[PDB]
Amino acid sequence: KFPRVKNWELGSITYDTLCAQSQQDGPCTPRRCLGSLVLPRPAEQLLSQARDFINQYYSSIKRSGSQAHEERLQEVEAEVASTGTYHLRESELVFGAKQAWRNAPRCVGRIQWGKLQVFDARDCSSAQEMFTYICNHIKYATNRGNLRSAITVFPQRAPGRGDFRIWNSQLVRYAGYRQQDGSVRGDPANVEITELCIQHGWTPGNGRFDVLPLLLQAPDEAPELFVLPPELVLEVPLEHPTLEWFAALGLRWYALPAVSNMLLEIGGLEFSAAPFSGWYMSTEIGTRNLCDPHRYNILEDVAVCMDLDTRTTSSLWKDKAAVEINLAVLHSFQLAKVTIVDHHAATVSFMKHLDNEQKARGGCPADWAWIVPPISGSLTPVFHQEMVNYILSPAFRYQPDPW
Amino acid sequence: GPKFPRVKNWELGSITYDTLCAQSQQDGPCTPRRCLGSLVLPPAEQLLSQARDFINQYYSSIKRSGSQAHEERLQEVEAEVASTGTYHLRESELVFGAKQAWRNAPRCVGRIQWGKLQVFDARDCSSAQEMFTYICNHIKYATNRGNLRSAITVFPQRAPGRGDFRIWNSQLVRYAGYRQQDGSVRGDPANVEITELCIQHGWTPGNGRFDVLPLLLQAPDEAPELFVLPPELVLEVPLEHPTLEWFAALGLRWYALPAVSNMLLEIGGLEFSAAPFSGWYMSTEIGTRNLCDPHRYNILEDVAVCMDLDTRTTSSLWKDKAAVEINLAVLHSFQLAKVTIVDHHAATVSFMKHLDNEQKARGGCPADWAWIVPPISGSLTPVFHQEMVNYILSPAFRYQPDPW
Numbered sequence: 001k002f003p004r005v006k007n008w009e010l011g012s013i014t015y016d017t018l019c020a021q022s023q024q025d026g027p028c029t030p031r032r033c034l035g036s037l038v039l040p041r042p043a044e045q046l047l048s049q050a051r052d053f054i055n056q057y058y059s060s061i062k063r064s065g066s067q068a069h070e071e072r073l074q075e076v077e078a079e080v081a082s083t084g085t086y087h088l089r090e091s092e093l094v095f096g097a098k099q100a101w102r103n104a105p106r107c108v109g110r111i112q113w114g115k116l117q118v119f120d121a122r123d124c125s126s127a128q129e130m131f132t133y134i135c136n137h138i139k140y141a142t143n144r145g146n147l148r149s150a151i152t153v154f155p156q157r158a159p160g161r162g163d164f165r166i167w168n169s170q171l172v173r174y175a176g177y178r179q180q181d182g183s184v185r186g187d188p189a190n191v192e193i194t195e196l197c198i199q200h201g202w203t204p205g206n207g208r209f210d211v212l213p214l215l216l217q218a219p220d221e222a223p224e225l226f227v228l229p230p231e232l233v234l235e236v237p238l239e240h241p242t243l244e245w246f247a248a249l250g251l252r253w254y255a256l257p258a259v260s261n262m263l264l265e266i267g268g269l270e271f272s273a274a275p276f277s278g279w280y281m282s283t284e285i286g287t288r289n290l291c292d293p294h295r296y297n298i299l300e301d302v303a304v305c306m307d308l309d310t311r312t313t314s315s316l317w318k319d320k321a322a323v324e325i326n327l328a329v330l331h332s333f334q335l336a337k338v339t340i341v342d343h344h345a346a347t348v349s350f351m352k353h354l355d356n357e358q359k360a361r362g363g364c365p366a367d368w369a370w371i372v373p374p375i376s377g378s379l380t381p382v383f384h385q386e387m388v389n390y391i392l393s394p395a396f397r398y399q400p401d402p403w
Numbered sequence: 404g405p406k407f408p409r410v411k412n413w414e415l416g417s418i419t420y421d422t423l424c425a426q427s428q429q430d431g432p433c434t435p436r437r438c439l440g441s442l443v444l445p446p447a448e449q450l451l452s453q454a455r456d457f458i459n460q461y462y463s464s465i466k467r468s469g470s471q472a473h474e475e476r477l478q479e480v481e482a483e484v485a486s487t488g489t490y491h492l493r494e495s496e497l498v499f500g501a502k503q504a505w506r507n508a509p510r511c512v513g514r515i516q517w518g519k520l521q522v523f524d525a526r527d528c529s530s531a532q533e534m535f536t537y538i539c540n541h542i543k544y545a546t547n548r549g550n551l552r553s554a555i556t557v558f559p560q561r562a563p564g565r566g567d568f569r570i571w572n573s574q575l576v577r578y579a580g581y582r583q584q585d586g587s588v589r590g591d592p593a594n595v596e597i598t599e600l601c602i603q604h605g606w607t608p609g610n611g612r613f614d615v616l617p618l619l620l621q622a623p624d625e626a627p628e629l630f631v632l633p634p635e636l637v638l639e640v641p642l643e644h645p646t647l648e649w650f651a652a653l654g655l656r657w658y659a660l661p662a663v664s665n666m667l668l669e670i671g672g673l674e675f676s677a678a679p680f681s682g683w684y685m686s687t688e689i690g691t692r693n694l695c696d697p698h699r700y701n702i703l704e705d706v707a708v709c710m711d712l713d714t715r716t717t718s719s720l721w722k723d724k725a726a727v728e729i730n731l732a733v734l735h736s737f738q739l740a741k742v743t744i745v746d747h748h749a750a751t752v753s754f755m756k757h758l759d760n761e762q763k764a765r766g767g768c769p770a771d772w773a774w775i776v777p778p779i780s781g782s783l784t785p786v787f788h789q790e791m792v793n794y795i796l797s798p799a800f801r802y803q804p805d806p807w
């Protein structure tokens with residue numbers, strides 16, 4: 001019934017009762033746990049999801065049962081009955097975006113969940129208008145390096161009509177150019193999107209950090225290509241605090257992590273284009289983006305620069321190089337005065353989050369495998385904390401690639 | 404396509420399906436509504452079906468499934484359970500079961516070695532004194548002057564209306580944990596209760612950080628008896644660092660042999676409450692968990708201060724730097740001492756090979772991602788990028804309540 005949740009560093013026990021509010025199935029069954037899989041394998045449906053969200057919204061503003069509540073419930077009921085769908089008021093939408101972030105089991109930055117700038121872009125009719133919105137989002141969120149969490153929401157999906165979509169997975173992404181000799185110049189995670197941009201008329205560069213154009217799509221139209229003004233895109237050159245040779249590597253990363261391919265679901269309504277951004281945790285760049293074998297894969301180069309023994313795993317050359325790389329990222333962002341958080345500070349704030357949420361809602365959906373950082377796992381408090389995972393709505397979801 | 408879990412590796416792009424999970428007979432803690440995969444500890448009718456299942460497994464592994472000897476063994480087990488309420492395994496059945504339990508263990512990253520396990524039959528054991536003799540033999544054989552060899556020793560099974568054989572200690576080798584007057588702990592905080600239990604049973608305690616605990620051994624329906632291990636039997640490795648010359652002066656050490664002793668070995672519904680087993684260490688167990696956990700030796704700050712690191716701020720990555728060097732010291736010293744050890748890279752690489760062997764051999768491999776991924780350098784090792792399916796196969800090692 002209710003999960004017993006234990007922290008093994010401190011011996012404390014909580015009991016998750018929030019999970020009882022879950023209405024969507026995850027991938028596990030009693031026969032087998034599939035919690036490490038990255039991706040998932042009528043009018044009353046909409047109406048119940050809508051009622052529940054409205055009920056959540058009016059509860060949040062401490063006005064459940066009131067005249068405005070009862071009335072809003074009928075507007076919704078009448079609109080669905082007549083049209084098969086309905087629309088959110090902006091304030092509701094602001095509440096919904098905030099709750100979807102709050103409910104995101106894989107996010108370690110949820111201490112911040114109540115501080116989210118919400119742009120209503122539901123009055124958008126063309127890819128061109130999507131671009132103006134995206135450009136303003138970037139300017140707002142970047143804020144000269146004093147980063148601010150933000151989401152822009154484009155029109156919801158509608159029965160028998162194509163979706164608004166941003167084709168890129170993030171608003172800022174480095175091109176990955178496939179060389180005929182097997183290798184890849186740039187970011188190999190972005191080969192396919194780079195090729196789509198080229199096919200749709202983009203003239204390609206040939207560096208390792210070429211900022212890609214955005215491919216934007218309004219419903220049932222071919223996507224259009226837009227180059228971001230280079231001044232909107234704040235980047236941080238990487239240097240190391242004591243290893244002067246490091247800056248010679250020419251490494252750099254962009255300040256703004258702005259994710260553009262997820263679908264935002266609120267009250268049964270689906271927003272297929274709703275880019276959001278906050279700020280980086282240093283390991284995203286330092287460990288995953290730069291050291292993952294299927295990414296920039298710079299572990300060996302840095303190791304040689306440090307003059308370690310590559311011939312054997314037991315010299316822990318990989319661990320040593322990785323730590324300096326992460327250190328280069330933290331030092332550099334702090335130097336360039338751009339918001340960033342290290343994995344220790346982040347995980348410590350997440351524990352406080354678990355505690356606030358335990359008192360606020362009786363629990364907190366969390367995916368242990370995603371919350372635990374990719375280096376120095378057990379050196380962080382979250383490693384030793386048991387977590388319960390489940391789907392609450394509003395929620396961010398994955399969705400198929402539009403091509 | 405197929406109606407079995409699809410399993411992806413995100414580094415390589417490769418896909419497999421787990422058909423093996425279809426053989427699973429026991430429910431884990433998850434449901435469609437919530438995943439509980441990160442929690443550490445979540446009648447003759449019943450017996451016979453488990454026994455029938457294991458016998459089928461056994462004859463399958465020797466390629467005699469459906470044969471005359473298969474059906475006779477089944478009938479023999481049905482009859483034995485019919486007259487005594489339990490039954491007994493043949494020696495080769497015990498050997499197969501023990502190995503299958505290790506093979507089936509989802510949290511073990513060392514399973515590439517599973518077919519190479521020396522099985523010591525000790526189902527003839529009738530006293531605590533004899534358990535000790537058995538245990539000492541195990542330690543000597545397994546330690547092998549540093550060229551470690553996997554082994555398990557199996558004492559008699561749970562009997563209806565009879566007390567269990569139990570080893571009270573969680574390992575055969577454990578450092579004492581002395582609760583101090585000032586509230587703190589000397590030695591290993593993990594071992595406070597077993598330490599106090601030993602003293603309550605007449606052990607005279609030391610006062611070191613690294614006092615080897617006596618064994619508390621229990622034959623059926625008798626009070627546990629106390630046995631001190633002769634020190635030459637317990638191989639230890641003093642820790643030093645290959646370049647940081649001061650590390651040796653910390654006086655840190657660890658023992659060679661990880662020999663877990665509080666787990667229950669289940670085979671065909673039979674329960675072996677006392678069946679200590681041992682392999683060799685992955686270096687992160689000592690370097691990261693035992694030495695760096697807040698609630699264990701907690702030496703991160705000491706080492707960092709010695710390395711002259713800025714421990715006032717998280718962003719200096721002083722915890723990460725110190726952790727690495729500690730782990731490096733564990734590896735270096737074990738190698739120098741010529742004691743078997745595997746680093747977290749070599750271990751995880753070998754586990755990927757195991758997943759590929761078991762894909763071909765059994766159509767999958769139950770695996771607990773949170774335990775398979777090492778506690779430092781996670782995404783630096785290949786298993787991080789590998790999806791895994793977790794489920795309970797039998798024969799199995801299970802946790803069991805503490806005897807007191």
Ligand code: HEM
Pocket residue numbers: 097101104106107108109110112116149150151276277278279280281284341346370396
């Ligand atoms: C403000 C500081 C933030 C920090 C430090 C942070 C940190 C992180 C990290 C490290 C991850 C793991 C991502 C990965 O490994 O690819 C993540 C995931 C995620 N974040 Fe946050 N995040 C922040 C803001 C936000 C905001 C503003 C939103 C939405 C409004 C959000 C929603 C999500 C979601 C839905 C995931 C799961 C992504 C997926 O499953 O692919 N986060 N976050």
Ligand code: HEM
Pocket residue numbers: 501505508510511512513514516520553554555680681682683684685688745750774800
């Ligand atoms: C041969 C070298 C071996 C290595 C390197 C190895 C490695 C490991 C590691 C690192 C763990 C994680 C334990 C923890 O973090 O507390 C583990 C767990 C485990 N191992 Fe292995 N292991 C080996 C041999 C064995 C053997 C011989 C057996 C039994 C016959 C075995 C059965 C288990 C079981 C049941 C677990 C899960 C323990 C638990 O859940 O508490 N292992 N192994």
Ligand SMILES: Nc1ccc2ccc(CNCCCc3cccnc3)cc2n1
Pocket residue numbers: 038039257259277278279280281284398
């Ligand atoms: N700092 C932040 C904040 C929020 C983030 C949200 C998402 C992401 C990246 N999402 C995971 C991408 C991996 C993937 C690949 C294929 C299919 N699904 C997911 C980073 C964030 N960083």
Ligand SMILES: Nc1ccc2ccc(CNCCCc3cccnc3)cc2n1
Pocket residue numbers: 443444513661663681682683684685688
């Ligand atoms: N190298 C090896 C080989 C086999 C091992 C088997 C078990 C263990 C430790 N088991 C986990 C103990 C921690 C714990 C505490 C409380 C409740 N559950 C588990 C190590 C092995 N190492």
Ligand SMILES: C[C@H](O)[C@H](O)[C@H]1CNc2nc(N)[nH]c(=O)c2N1
Pocket residue numbers: 035036037038369370371413787788789790791
């Ligand atoms: C297979 C495994 O679930 C997958 O590689 C996950 C593990 N944990 C992760 N955690 C984070 N933060 N990001 C990731 O991409 C992943 N990948």
Ligand SMILES: C[C@H](O)[C@H](O)[C@H]1CNc2nc(N)[nH]c(=O)c2N1
Pocket residue numbers: 008383384385386387441442443773774775
């Ligand atoms: C809460 C969490 O499950 C717990 O800290 C686990 C995580 N993974 C682990 N992995 C291993 N190998 N050993 C452990 O003790 C643990 N502890």
Ligand SMILES: [Zn+2]
Pocket residue numbers: 028032033034035433437438439440
């Ligand atoms: Zn699960």
